[PDB]
Amino acid sequence: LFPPQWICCDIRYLDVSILGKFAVVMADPPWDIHMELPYGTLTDDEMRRLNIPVLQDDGFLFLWVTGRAMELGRECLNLWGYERVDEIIWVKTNQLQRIIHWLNHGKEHCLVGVKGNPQGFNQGLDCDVIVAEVRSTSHKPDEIYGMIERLSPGTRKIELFGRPHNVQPNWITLGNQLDGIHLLDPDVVARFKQRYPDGIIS
Amino acid sequence: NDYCQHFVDTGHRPQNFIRDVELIRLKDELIAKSNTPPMYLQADIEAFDIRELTPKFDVILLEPPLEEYYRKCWTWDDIMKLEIDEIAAPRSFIFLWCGSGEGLDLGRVCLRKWGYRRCEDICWIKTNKNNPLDPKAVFQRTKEHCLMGIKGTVDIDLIITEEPEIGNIEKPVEIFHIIEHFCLGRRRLHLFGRDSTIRPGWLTVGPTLTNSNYNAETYASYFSAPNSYLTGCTEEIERL
Ligand SMILES: Nc1ncnc2c1ncn2[C@@H]1O[C@H](CNCCNc2ncnc3c2ncn3[C@@H]2O[C@@H](CO)[C@@H](O)[C@H]2O)[C@@H](O)[C@H]1O
Ligand SMILES: [Mg+2]
Structure with missing residues (x-):
């Protein structure tokens, strides 16, 4: 069911097996980098224990990383059964196309992992650099969804740790700052009602 | 404006439209004064101790000739067996120049194998203003990574230039x-x-x-006291 769908939940406890299989997985996880943090974070073990492996048979993972999560993200990516085959760089500009410990950071990284053998994807249409303006804090650019749609048009996709602005057609967004549960795909709706007759994750 | 869409339409890489490419020039001058003379040595590094x-x-600074630069090459097998530590x-x-492929993973193993931790990921972004694939590649690769590692206790992490011929x-x-x-010290080594x-x-x-002038004793003489701990960014120490 093409229109946006989402599930407010704690992704640690949600039984993601009810959601089926996706051509693309994207995540912008709340990595525990050594800081106070304006939001809540996931420990390295919770990140490792996420049940990503059930979400795909053949397809691509997009995984935002920063700081020491450039290494931890690679660990998670490999533990979950993916091979890192590409790495997208978003160059952060202002409205005038100028770029915003040892060096100042003009960019954020997005690891691209493959699992299985995806077939019928349009590999090579886009290039691995995004130039796009910063929006709110920890707000990734919209251009990633068009890149992902040209790569795998019309397939089901799932985003983890998304926020309300992340909800898109063809995507199921999970996150704990979404508003409630909006589900339209009848297969998903059925399995959700079965797993959660009273509509609560614990 | 969606520059990813634009590249799909026109072939102009999104980085083609980045603009802007006191004075840190006194610093460049202090660097230039404290610089040792250039020294160089021909060595076949596979067979070399x-x-x-x-x-x-x-x-x-480690710049092994990766096979992927050509489209003697060094594989990551060869590289991680170097005794850099x-x-x-x-x-x-x-x-460490890692390329854009498996080097982004195998280069991190190298850094860890030699005792370093990565503190920066410097990206060389290549524009194609003048001319608008690996089997596993999902995207067109338009950049290379130079990983920065540290061991022991003004600039941005991006270089933008036109893709070379x-x-x-x-x-x-x-x-x-x-x-x-960075003013990290004066013993600077460029391998390859x-x-x-x-x-x-x-x-x-x-x-x-094609030529060498390296002499270990001569080279060490540039850092004998009182110059052993200079950062490479300070005035020289006066003599006689
Ligand atoms: N067990 C879990 N299960 C499911 N989702 C989880 C989760 N544990 C964390 N999440 C959710 O994963 C998302 C992680 N996204 C990474 C991007 N980073 C930011 N995310 C959100 N707000 C931010 C961010 N950076 C600055 N802010 C500012 O602070 C806020 C409050 O002050 C707000 O006002 C912003 O403006 C996030 O939604 C988490 O809640
Ligand atoms: Mg050794």
Whole structure:
């Protein structure tokens, strides 16, 4: 069911097996980098224990990383059964196309992992650099969804740790700052009602 | 404006539309004064005992000829068997050119294998304003990564230049400016440099060098007291 769908939940406890299989997985996880943090974070073990492996048979993972999560993200990516085959760089500009410990950071990284053998994807249409303006804090650019749609048009996709602005057609967004549960795909709706007759994750 | 869409339409890479490419020039001048004379040595590094390279270095810049630069090549197998930890100073830094493929993973193993942790990921973004694939590639690769590692206790992490002509494997000389502006020490080693990369303040060692002038004793003499701990960014120490 093409229109946006989402599930407010704690992704640690949600039984993601009810959601089926996706051509693309994207995540912008709340990595525990050594800081106070304006939001809540996931420990390295919770990140490792996420049940990503059930979400795909053949397809691509997009995984935002920063700081020491450039290494931890690679660990998670490999533990979950993916091979890192590409790495997208978003160059952060202002409205005038100028770029915003040892060096100042003009960019954020997005690891691209493959699992299985995806077939019928349009590999090579886009290039691995995004130039796009910063929006709110920890707000990734919209251009990633068009890149992902040209790569795998019309397939089901799932985003983890998304926020309300992340909800898109063809995507199921999970996150704990979404508003409630909006589900339209009848297969998903059925399995959700079965797993959660009273509509609560614990 | 969606520059990803635009590249799909026109072939102009999104980085083609980045603009803007007191004074840090006194700093460049202090760097230039404290620079040791250029020293260089032809060495076939596979067959070489790098322990002969002394003293131990404050900075190592490592630029192995990857097969992927050509479309003797060094595989990551060969690279991670280099005994870099035997010539690095207990507190020191490495800058490792990793390419854009498996090098982004195997280069991190190398850094860890030699005792470093990565503190920066410097990206060389290549524009194609003048001319608008690996089987596993999902996207067109338009950049290379130079990983920065540290061991022991003004600039941005992006270099933007036009894609060099096919067959040209040189890396942007801007990498030297970034390194030297960090003021990390004066023993600087460039492994797999060339005649065209030789540069004041650096020891260059590579197989294609046509001449050598390296002498370990002469080289160590540049850092004997009172100069042992200079950062490379300060005034020289006065003599007689
Ligand atoms: N067990 C879990 N299960 C499911 N989702 C989880 C989760 N544990 C964390 N999440 C959710 O994963 C998302 C992680 N996204 C990474 C991007 N980073 C930011 N995310 C959100 N707000 C931010 C961010 N950076 C600055 N802010 C500012 O602070 C806020 C409050 O002050 C707000 O006002 C912003 O403006 C996030 O939604 C988490 O809640
Ligand atoms: Mg050894």
